[PDB]
Design a binder for these strands. Sequence first.
RNA 1: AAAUUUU
RNA 2: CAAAAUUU
RNA 3: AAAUUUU
RNA 4: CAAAAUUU
Lengths: 629, 628
Amino acid sequence: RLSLEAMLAERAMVARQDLAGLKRKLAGADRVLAPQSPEQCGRESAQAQARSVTSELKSAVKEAQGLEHQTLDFLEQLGEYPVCGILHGDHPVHPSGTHNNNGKVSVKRQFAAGSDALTCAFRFEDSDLVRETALKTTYTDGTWAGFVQRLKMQTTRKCVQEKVSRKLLKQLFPYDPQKLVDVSGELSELVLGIKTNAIASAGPPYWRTKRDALPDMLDCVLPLLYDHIVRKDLTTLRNKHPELFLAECKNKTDRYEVESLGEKTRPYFSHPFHLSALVSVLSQSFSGALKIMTEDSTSFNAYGFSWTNGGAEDLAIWARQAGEAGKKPPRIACYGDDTDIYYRKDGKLYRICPDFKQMDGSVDATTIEAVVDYVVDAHVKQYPTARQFWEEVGKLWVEMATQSPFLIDGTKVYRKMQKDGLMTGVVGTTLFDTVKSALAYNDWADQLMFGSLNLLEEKYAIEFFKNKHGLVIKEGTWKPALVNEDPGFGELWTEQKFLGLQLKVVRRENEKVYVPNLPFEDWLTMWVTPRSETETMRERTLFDRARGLLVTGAVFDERARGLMGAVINSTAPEVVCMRVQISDGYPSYDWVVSLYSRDHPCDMPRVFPEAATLIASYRKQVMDTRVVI
Amino acid sequence: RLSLEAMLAERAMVARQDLAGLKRKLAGADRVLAPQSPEQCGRESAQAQARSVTSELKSAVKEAQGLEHQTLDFLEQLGEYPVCGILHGDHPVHPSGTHNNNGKVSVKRQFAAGSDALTCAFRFEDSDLVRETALKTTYTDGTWAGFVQRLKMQTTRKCVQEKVSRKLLKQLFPYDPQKLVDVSGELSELVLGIKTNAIASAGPPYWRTKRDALPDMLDCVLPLLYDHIVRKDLTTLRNKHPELFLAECKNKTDRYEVESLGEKTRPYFSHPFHLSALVSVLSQSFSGALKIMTEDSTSFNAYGFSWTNGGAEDLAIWARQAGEAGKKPPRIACYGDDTDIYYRKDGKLYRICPDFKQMDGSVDATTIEAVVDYVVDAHVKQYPTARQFWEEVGKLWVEMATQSPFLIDGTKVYRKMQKDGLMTGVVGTTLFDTVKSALAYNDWADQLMFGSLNLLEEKYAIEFFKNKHGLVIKEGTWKPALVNEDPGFGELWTEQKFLGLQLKVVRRENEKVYVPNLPFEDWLTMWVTPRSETETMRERTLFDRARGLLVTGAVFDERARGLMGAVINSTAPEVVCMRVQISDGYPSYDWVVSLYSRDHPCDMPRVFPEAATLIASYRKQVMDTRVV
RNA sequence: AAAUUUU
RNA sequence: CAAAAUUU
RNA sequence: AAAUUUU
RNA sequence: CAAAAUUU
Ligand SMILES: [Mg+2]
Ligand SMILES: [Mg+2]
Ligand SMILES: [Mg+2]
């Protein structure tokens, strides 16, 4: 049946899954060890210290979770919605058990309290530093109090309608028309082309993951929706089946400061799959086309930027051609509220990296409608035949971004009082944020051309954004700094962070490679707060995260490189060469430097160079058949 | 992360493994039912009759398995061999537990006395006919007695050296030189190119399957063997490690007549992996090049022939251009001892389909050496740079086919006394048989050109092959028959079987398709004796075998088509659309006819046409974005 | 599967 | 993990 | 995985 | 199943 070559491939594939034999075969194998930091104490002592810290964190979190949460009076109320009765064959779309107290759609918000990574950290670095950094922040569900507080900040903020046109958006957000999907083709194929998180909630009315809910959305609800869209019949469908247009307001689990646990917890909105999917066609095509600022000088857009393969250097070469403030144009780039501003002053280059507080709450209805228009238009320009249909989708998109009815906890249904303010979680969220941001910063530069250079000062800039745009600058982020225009080996660009990373220069054979960087404390904080079950898979997760952080820029910090190296070298060979979804290479300093330089891509150095042959139990060995006998 | 199209494919692949949900999803689906025969009796009554037949067969088999087996005096004896001590890294090549009583290599022969196919048959066809056909034959390991008797027949037969040259073999077995492997390259790659049964025994000294034993052969034993081959040092390696050149004699499990259980049990020889692989390079390349008789008028070779895609018709058009016996050349084709002879007599076309008795025992040393030479030569002609090495492999091939030392049961080692007689199991077995056969039949035709037409008669032909070639014609197989040169719809070519099948013509659209056929009794015999455990997998096996038989030609017999249809239609939908190694189509009469006709290939009709969408839970439905 | 970033 | 961007 | 075929 | 040939 099979050939020997194929039989060997077939047996190699299975050997990487037989971890007992992999462990047996790789015992005592030559191993390329990573640069590593010495161990400070034993794994058992380290477990004890980790256990201790985890306990302190659990009790502080529980404390903050017991705080009273201010009422939800600031939201309009639409009573209770009935459970959707739509059936797809043998089963209902809305499952029988879930999200239904009786008749009415209900929802229960999750705030729970309460690490192998913290253990490792205690194993390889100074106890007191690990302790205080692991107590500064924590990955958690947040608190009811801070949830409601940030929700109020983002649903009730006094906004300022922006002054925007397609002319302006063409200027600030150039794209490449020929990279837009052909949006006139059948809807089914177009929807089948979009990408999505298979594990994410499909939202109402499916109340399961998207891979679970895909057929029910696809052959049942989406055709009904289409029927009613072209029949101009949407509001009677909204009446017959309210749950089809309902969202769920949810608390984002992530890294939070512990001291601020009762003030800060991000809210976001889960939308129905059939609506998000429909809009995603346009959204994702547009993301496909959008140029970034290193490609096109007029662009204010950094959404699509990459640090790797020259990106850092590109950012530098871009920035450093900014003009004298008041005379020539500055260099401004935005990714959401995360902005990077460069400007000159008596020839000398300066940089500012400001953030905005609850940026969603500052995004105005005019801006949202203008962006939806700009996208739909960008498509129907290239593909006129479908104009009407997608315009009818635009009307939906906007009502989804500004005025969706939504659940929070239990059966009550709410809605934002004003049209202004973005419902974070809607398709296009990041783009709306980026746009509003760039529009404001463009008005800023325009005011600089009219001699208002006192807008370069914290004092007046805060006023400007508050009064002219409704943007609240997270204080202390407007601190302009002198740029080291041409850094020497090991020197920073500035100490400021853009997209969470400092820019730095490193030596490579007398060349200067621009790379990301952070101080050790930051890398260690990221190490000890992973975002999330055999011993094996956990050991592998440790390995993977170490590699990841190294690649992100931890290899360019002394202490962090040592810690990640120690983790890697602890990893048992079976776990390194394991079949996972294998890569059994580690990132050396040199390889990562190559990753960020413009070099052609290439594979990581193998941890066990001769592992393939040791596993397969067979080298090739040249045997000449032309030999004389 | 993923796209919806891909997510749906991913979800479809897993739904075909969840048989509960598969059953649920297919509950009310349209089913393309196969042509079927009505039920003769209930499932429980049929179970009772099957149980009964199984009991009678078990006790007859046990009886025949207890018979005394005549001594092994007819074989040379070389005593006991020591267990090979070669190590490959951390473990020995010869595992610690197995095939070692102490110090010495030992082997234990398996004769066990051991049906729901029979159940199905009793359910859907006449009770008495099913009973007697299921008692005529049985799939079994055989008996010690018949094992030793046939071993004696194939190791001690008085042979007749054939009269052979490369000239003759070029004539009878033409090939296409440019389809031969470039055998001058590196050995590793060439050996990696050969195909093999991954589950088969690698034989001594590995004593495990070939996929288990592949690395040990590949990076350890094969280099040692090469070293000693080019160093001209083979016999001292044979001395240091005898088990490297040892074979295992084995009893073939298969379909046996119950009446003949103590007279007939096929022996064959499992050879070492490192030797078989090395020879396979040449053997398989040559098979790649070898022409067949429907390609080349001079060829006597039918090894490579296919019934499908016109093959049957090709056989007809070939045959019917045979000449008047004594004046012009006949048409003769061989596949092992299975031969097909066509000749004319006063213009009228005749056919003969004779077989030989234990043909391996009749295969002479001259023929084996000549074939090995012909193959090695065919290669080193095209690729001279590699001559010596492959010539040294030829010497091995020959000693492997004629004179291998071998085990049977226990520790004693034996060897064939004579060089004559082929050791079935060696690489190239079928080709050696085909050549010996064709050589004899060519001498037959040559005697026909010299006016000896009484060789067309059973009485003198049997003599001819016995005396001039050592070939013993299984009696009653030389019965020449008048060919229906141009058959009408539904008529046979002749009633004779070649490659186990009758030739027949069926109608399609006023056109005649040539197809294989067998009488019902034969299809039923094959049905009730399968060759080899959940409810699921057994229910699926019934389905698979029914499909298989239908495709082989059972769809062209009424009663057999009905039985296979009934089996297929019994198969629960979950089992049809199950993820297996899916195909969830059945072979309709029309599709099988297309298979044997010259039509372009195409897939079987789905049993459940709308099953894909029912499983995925989505049928595409065009919704146009250009609507007002 | 994993790392980082934004809302 | 609601939408997303970069990377292995 | 399955069917047929030769030794 | 020891070598194999044809086939899905
Ligand atoms: Mg912010
Ligand atoms: Mg025969
Ligand atoms: Mg015979």
